[PDB]
C-alpha cells in the first residue's frame, strides 16, 4: 500500500536520524579510547 510505504519512510527517517545520534557516540567513544591509550602508552 502507498500509505504503508510512507510509514516505512517515516520509520527509516527516524531510524536514520537516530543513527546520526549513534555515529557521534562512536566517534566520541572511539576518540576517548584513542586518547587514553596514547596518553598512557607514553607514560614515562
Amino acid at each position: 500500500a502507498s500509505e504503508e510505504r510512507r510509514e516505512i519512510a517515516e520509520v527509516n527517517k527516524k531510524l536514520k536520524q537516530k543513527n546520526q545520534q549513534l555515529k557521534q557516540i562512536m566517534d566520541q567513544l572511539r576518540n576517548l579510547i584513542w586518547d587514553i591509550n596514547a596518553m598512557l602508552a607514553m607514560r614515562n
Binding site: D27, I33, W34, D35, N37, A38, M39, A41, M42, N44
Partner: protein, 250 residues
C-alpha cells in the same frame, strides 16, 4: 592555600617556556625533510600536505592528546639524565646507560647499537605522532563514511583496544546484508603506520598502501566488488548449484 596555587602556575609557566624552547631550537637547527617555520610564539610546520601544526605557546582544535604528550615527553628527555639506569650494578664502573654498558661487552651488532643512540629528540617524536594522529582520522572517517555510502555489503570495523602512538590496529569484516554465518568472507587487518597504512588480506596477500585518504577508499571499493563475487562462490558451495570457472582478479 593561596600561595600554593600561585606558585604552581609559575612552575607550569617555567616548564612550558622550556618546552617551546626545546621545540624551537630543534625545528630550525635540524632538518627532517619538512619545512618548519618559526614565528614569535608559533612554530608552524607541515607534516602532511593537508595538515598544519600550530604548536603555539599561549601567554596570559586543541587536541589535548598531542598537547599533554609534550609535557610528558619532555620528562623522558629530562629523565634520561641523572637516572637510576645510569649507575652501574657493579660498584666500580663509569657512569653510563646501563643497557649501553652491557651492549658493548656482549657483542651487540653494528646496527642495533647505532639505532639506540639515534634518538630523535622532541620535535620528531611529536610531528611523527601528529603525522599519525590525523592519518588515523583520514582512515577512520573513510571507513565510517564508507559504511553509510555503500549499503549493499556492510563494512564492519572492530577497532583494537590497545593502539599506542605510532601504531593502530584494525579489523575489517566485509559481510553482506545479514548472511554472517552462511557467508563469512574476506576480512583484512589494516594497520595504521606513521607514514603509510599497512594491510594484510584475508587470503594471504599483503598490500603496503598509500598514505592519502583517496587511495584507501579505492582499496576498500576494489575489495567491495571482490566480496560480491565471493558471495557467488559461497552460495555455490551451499546451494544446489555447482562451481564453474573462477576468476579472482580480472
Amino acid at each position: 592555600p593561596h600561595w600554593q596555587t600561585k606558585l604552581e602556575a609559575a612552575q607550569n609557566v617555567l616548564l612550558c617556556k622550556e618546552i617551546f624552547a626545546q621545540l624551537s631550537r630543534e625545528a630550525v637547527q635540524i632538518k627532517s625533510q619538512v619545512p618548519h617555520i618559526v614565528v614569535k610564539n608559533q612554530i608552524i610546520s607541515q607534516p602532511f600536505p593537508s595538515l598544519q601544526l600550530s604548536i603555539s605557546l599561549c601567554h596570559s582544535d586543541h587536541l589535548y592528546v598531542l598537547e599533554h604528550n609534550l609535557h610528558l615527553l619532555i620528562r623522558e628527555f629530562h629523565k634520561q639524565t641523572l637516572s637510576s639506569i645510569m649507575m652501574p650494578h657493579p660498584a666500580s664502573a663509569p657512569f653510563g646507560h646501563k643497557r649501553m654498558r652491557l651492549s658493548g661487552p656482549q657483542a651487540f651488532d653494528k646496527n642495533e647499537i647505532n639505532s639506540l643512540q639515534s634518538s630523535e629528540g622532541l620535535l620528531e617524536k611529536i610531528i611523527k605522532q601528529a603525522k599519525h594522529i590525523f592519518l588515523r582520522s583520514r582512515a577512520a572517517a573513510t571507513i565510517d563514511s564508507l559504511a553509510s555510502r555503500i549499503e549493499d555489503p556492510q563494512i564492519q570495523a572492530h577497532w583494537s583496544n590497545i593502539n599506542d602512538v605510532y601504531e593502530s590496529s584494525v579489523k575489517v569484516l566485509i559481510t553482506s546484508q545479514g548472511y554472517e554465518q552462511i557467508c563469512k568472507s574476506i576480512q583484512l587487518q589494516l594497520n595504521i603506520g606513521v607514514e603509510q597504512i599497512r594491510v594484510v588480506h584475508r587470503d594471504g596477500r599483503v598490500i603496503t598502501l598509500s598514505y592519502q585518504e583517496q587511495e584507501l577508499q579505492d582499496f576498500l571499493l576494489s575489495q567491495m566488488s571482490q566480496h560480491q563475487v565471493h558471495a557467488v562462490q559461497q552460495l555455490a558451495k551451499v546451494m544446489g548449484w555447482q562451481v564453474l570457472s573462477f576468476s579472482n582478479h580480472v
